[PDB]
Amino acid sequence: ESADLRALAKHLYDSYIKSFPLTKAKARAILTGKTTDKSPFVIYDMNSLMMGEDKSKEVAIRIFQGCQFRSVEAVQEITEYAKSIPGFVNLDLNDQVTLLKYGVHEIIYTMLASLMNKDGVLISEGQGFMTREFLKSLRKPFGDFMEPKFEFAVKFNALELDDSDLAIFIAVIILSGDRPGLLNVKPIEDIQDNLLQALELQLKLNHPESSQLFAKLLQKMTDLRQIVTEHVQLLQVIKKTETDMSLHPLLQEIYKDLY
Ligand SMILES: CCCCCCCCC(=O)O
Ligand SMILES: CCCCCCCCC(=O)O
Ligand SMILES: CCCCCCCCC(=O)O
């Protein structure tokens, strides 16, 4: 069984690497000054934004729109990864859609942590770095979007997970049998069972000194789902205050009738 679990962990890490262009490994090399990668241009105000703006008439809106395109791009990457999770594509098509609908954002903020430190977040495939203070200074409610993600990331990052850990963890998230409107819960839970087994052994092997890291990681789901509920509330505000703004269709279908 252990051999089967090792094989599963390796398959997922392989697909993860193939699906996600900017890994945590690379992100850290950029943030911490490694010679394997290149230094980011740092955006911390209006001017540095304009100078860096080489890589709807208001910086706050423009940044939001930009972040929105990246979210769309991420959903595409996550969708591709999901298909590699054994059993996923064999599930009822309606459930596949539902799993992605509720799962993508929890994964987005999980992986966004990889791009974050206390001071800011990597952007533009790691070529840029936008500071936390700059984002927090944006006119309401745009300045309220990222702060909670930073708070979560600082805590999540303390777990010191690597890409091979994350690959299994995000698979676990996708295969959540508690998603609203699931037609066949059992098949989903059977898959998650295996993934959980795989994650458990992976953490034991990769972090033999970090006791109950498995339990601690699973508990991070609480903060994760808290983030999304808060995020949704913020989107509802802008929808009413900025009637000239359009949320990307892919992103609309995700939030439509969400919780
Ligand atoms: C000022 C940065 C705010 C980014 C918000 C991203 C919204 C898109 C999403 O819901 O996936
Ligand atoms: C602040 C811009 C990034 C917010 C959009 C979500 C990014 C997706 C990701 O990189 O995981
Ligand atoms: C110039 C506004 C922000 C651009 C977002 C590009 C990707 C950001 C990220 O990966 O978190």
Numbering used by the authors: 207 to 261, 274 to 477
What does the paper say about this structure?
Like other NRs, PPARs bind specific DNA response elements (PPREs), usually as a heterodimer with retinoid X receptor, and modulate transcription of nearby genes by recruiting coregulator complexes. Agonists alter target gene expression by binding the ligand binding pocket (LBP) in the core of the ligand binding domain (LBD).
We obtained PPARγ LBD crystals without exogenous ligand and subsequent X-ray structural analysis revealed that they diffracted to relatively high resolution (2.1 Å). The LBD crystallized as a homodimer (A and B-chains) with the A-chain exactly corresponding to the canonical active NR LBD fold with H12 in an active position and the B-chain in an inactive conformation with H12 protruding away from the molecule. The structure resembles previous liganded and unliganded PPARs but close investigation reveals three saturated medium chain fatty acids (MCFAs) occupy the LBP at the same time and mass spectroscopic analysis suggests that these are predominantly nonanoic acid (NA, C9) with a smaller amount of octanoic acid (OA, C8). Each MCFA binds one arm of the PPARγ A-chain LBP and, together, the three molecules occupy about 52% (≈630 Å3) of LBP total volume. NA1 is within the polar arm, close to H12, and makes extensive contacts with LBP amino acids. NA2 occupies a site between H1, H3 and H4/5 with the carboxylate group in contact with R288 (3.2 Å) on H3 and the tail stabilized by hydrophobic interactions with A292, I296, M329 and L330. NA3 is close to the base of the Y, between H3 and the β-strands. Like NA2, the NA3 carboxylate also interacts with the R288 side chain (3.87 Å, Nε) and also binds the main chain at L340 (3.2 Å) and the NA hydrophobic tail interacts with I341 and C285.
